[PDB]
């Protein structure tokens, strides 16, 4: 029953250096996003927890470790999805078991599925779990692309609550909300968060709110509040964080940021590389100097 | 001179069957614009006035007769861009004469200019004309990704006003907007109005204001009022017959559009399809119906 | 030491209609391919056999039964990749106890892995194992370009074979025959055999082999002999065939077509579609009239 | 009725440093071409000969010095198309008058125009001129596709001959050639000549041909013999060239090359970059030393 409305940061993992998971710095995590950056919720097992670089048993140690973690602090979204749907069935009855208060699940991605593919997908996760379900859509990694009847058919399963809408076509977007003004949209892209929630969506989804989380909150509540001027100045400030973590490696620099405030985030797993360069740890010092000090 | 701000419609043109232009149906086409749009300028032979179908004599008399008919009612851009740098330098000199207010170029297309070729065309023209210069960047035709670092090479040139963004990257807008924050942005995406307006853009030019300007001017006085649940309204039934005109074939249902208010806006110009089918016709009057009656 | 060149199909895995591995059926689809098709080898646990749809005990058990089934008759490559890099070194040491002639690894996908992990990800497979790998690279469903130079750094680890290259560049292809000599390329389009082979590939490696086996080593050989005019009418009729398949779905329609020889190539596995419809039934058995019988 | 097979260069145009057409420059590259390339035929007014950044006399200036100075040795074909379809039929009229063999058209770009759209476009040049017509298909340029279906409706006017086809897509090549055996395709990529040539086009036309025509004819004869290792050693070497060329600047570089073999082939047209740098000098004259005796 839960209210899924608002700012989730989407989970990042702490790793050691061979790619297992470091539970005590995971927890960390957990409580800094809860305690520190203030979020509504977590967005366990997405891109930004690095999900699918990882095995069945890992994600499932994730769902439960942050679960033990956030207990009923805060709202907690499982995101399941994989090109292997029996995985997901496997991953969403466990996480449902666990009490997450929605499953979500990526476009099945790789092989170019259809679209009647990709709906039953959806409906089958949904049928073995029972939860809510929430559509995750990022284009620029998946190349799937969903219209607006598209989504349309995907909602006729009325346990679909909506879209977590890491795309940048705003068009659809507003499309979206006009066509399904009962389902919800979670912005995806956090340097676009201003112009997102000027369209009404019902929340946010971002890795950066794992270190900037209480400006994230202000721009969208200024926003929808009116207050346009106030919250650009502060997505102004975001965005020079942003194109700097961008520039230095996204998930070794949030980490590093988190290390900084004394947050045990550890490495990154492989493939992707596992820890920066000294030239971009004196780097991200200086990000932490100018916008998080 | 003339303050550059606000909304300006990209003049559609009147054209007889044989591609030729109609003067007196593109006079009603200008003071439509100006005396019941309500528009703050026009844009003049940018994509929407079927531009890069004509040749240099037909671009001459289309600028003659818009400034001749406006006079100095509202303010003027002409855009004078081409593949063809000399055409470009004889229309802004053109242009110029006329006392047009402003130039405005499309970033050079069909070869794969470099950068520096870019930027040496806009100097070219602006030394050779001595007027202002609006930069036109329409991607998703032209295929030219211009960065931050790149336009703000191109605002070394103290006559660049800025750009006219005909682009979804809202990203990009805003740091455009951080880095150069005394230079303008129109906007050029209708459909996406409210969420360019939130983002703080000066302007906006569009083909759907020549019917549907006294909504345009509201979603963008609202937004610049935070009153944002009153602008999405109105851009949520902008966006219905936005869709709905889409559709039905862009240029020739915003004519036939115009054509219903009495307007001569005539044919458009091969190889476009020259006039709408009789189920278009009955289309376009439905929305005639639904959305400007 | 087994050669590695000429002709391998890229194996069809037979499902249940649960999902599961149909072992009898398995087998006959790789006694069909060793003594109907009469390939040099397999290509095992590939896109095309719904390898990335599966868990890892499942690709584990496929290889098994494809190497007590083949036993030493044939050469075997196994394909190892994935996203998951612990996942790929403990397949490819699975694979190397079994006795598989070679691994192969897809680029790893979904992230936008840089060149830097890339290569790191071939090596880390190859340094855990000490088998040869062949570089798996499919543009078209991964999003990863590979150049000329990027191919050398890759093939400074001497246990790198080569690179089965389903990719369409002929320029490219050339360039890399030119550049690395002495390293294999196996063409992964069967409709594009003859240019490929024609340029000085070693070999193919294909999803049609499962079932036009002898027509795939006709072009093959002939074009090698240079008996253009004969390889071509060969390819044509091929290629009539592959036009048939792709548009009925290419996976079922290669395992109807299986089926209609007395072969047990099962469903295909979720979310892709399981089952061919009657229409599309009727269809493929037009195919085997016109071209298999 | 002249035979349009075999090799054609696509003509580059000597420009004075103003922009202006140096005449005296054009009918020696054009003497080139017919004495030392020993071409079959020369495609006028296409993409290589910086066609598309002049005016429509221009153009027309280009065509008359080529026909002048060809006069009937070699076949001519006349590039007559634009974004403007009442120019195209301005200049295809104008080159019909001049006695050139048969027009060809370049895909309507820019606007994105219909697949019905682009048909009456090649259907209204022809008819208002009367002469062949070949469609020249450059998607890297353009961004049209056109698919085999596409093709035949554009071949069901019986005055289309076939297809300049400067495409990288070898199954689209072969399914062309195995629906309409009787109409012709020319290759347009140098580079990948011996591939399009073992699936039997009919010719080749290209920018590299103005200097390396000897090997460009070796490559294609040999291969229509089946005399493919030799052939691919000549595309070996021929590509070398090419990588450099392209490297250094393509238009510029060949200019340079003839220019060292006593050609006066100018400047390229702003906003090309019109000269090259004394460093590019210099690499060019080790491609020739290397590659061009």
């Not at 991953?91 to 476009?107: H, N, P, Q």
């Not at 969506?201 to 270190?211: H, R």
Request: charged share 25%.
């Amino acid at each position: 029953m839960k209210n899924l409305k608002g700012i989730f940061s989407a989970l990042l993992v702490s790793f050691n250096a061979d790619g297992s998971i470091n539970e005590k710095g995971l927890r960390q995590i957990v409580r800094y996003n809860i305690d520190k950056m203030k979020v509504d919720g977590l967005y366990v097992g997405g891109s930004t927890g690095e999900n699918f670089m990882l095995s069945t048993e890992e994600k499932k140690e994730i769902f439960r470790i942050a679960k033990d973690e956030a207990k009923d602090e805060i709202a907690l979204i499982a995101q399941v999805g994989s090109v292997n749907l029996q995985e997901a069935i496997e991953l969403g009855k466990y996480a449902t078991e666990l009490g997450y208060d929605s499953l979500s699940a990526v476009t099945p991605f790789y092989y170019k599925f259809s679209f009647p593919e990709i709906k039953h997908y959806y409906d089958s996760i949904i049928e073995a779990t029972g939860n809510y379900m929430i559509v995750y859509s990022i284009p620029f990694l998946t190349g799937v692309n969903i219209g607006v009847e598209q989504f349309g058919e995907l909602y006729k399963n009325p346990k679909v609550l909506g879209v977590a809408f890491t795309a940048g076509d705003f068009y659809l977007l507003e499309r979206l909300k006009k066509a399904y003004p009962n389902h919800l949209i979670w912005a995806g892209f956090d340097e676009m968060m201003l112009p997102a929630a000027s369209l009404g969506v019902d929340g946010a989804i971002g890795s950066t709110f794992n270190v900037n989380g209480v400006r994230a909150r202000q721009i969208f509540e200024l926003t929808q509040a009116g207050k346009l001027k106030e919250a650009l100045e502060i997505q102004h400030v975001t965005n020079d964080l942003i194109e700097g973590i961008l520039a230095n490696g996204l998930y070794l620099t949030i980490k590093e940021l988190l290390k900084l405030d004394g947050v045990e985030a550890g490495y990154c797993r492989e493939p992707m590389t596992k820890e920066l360069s000294s030239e971009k740890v004196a780097f991200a010092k200086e990000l932490k100097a100018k916008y998080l000090s």
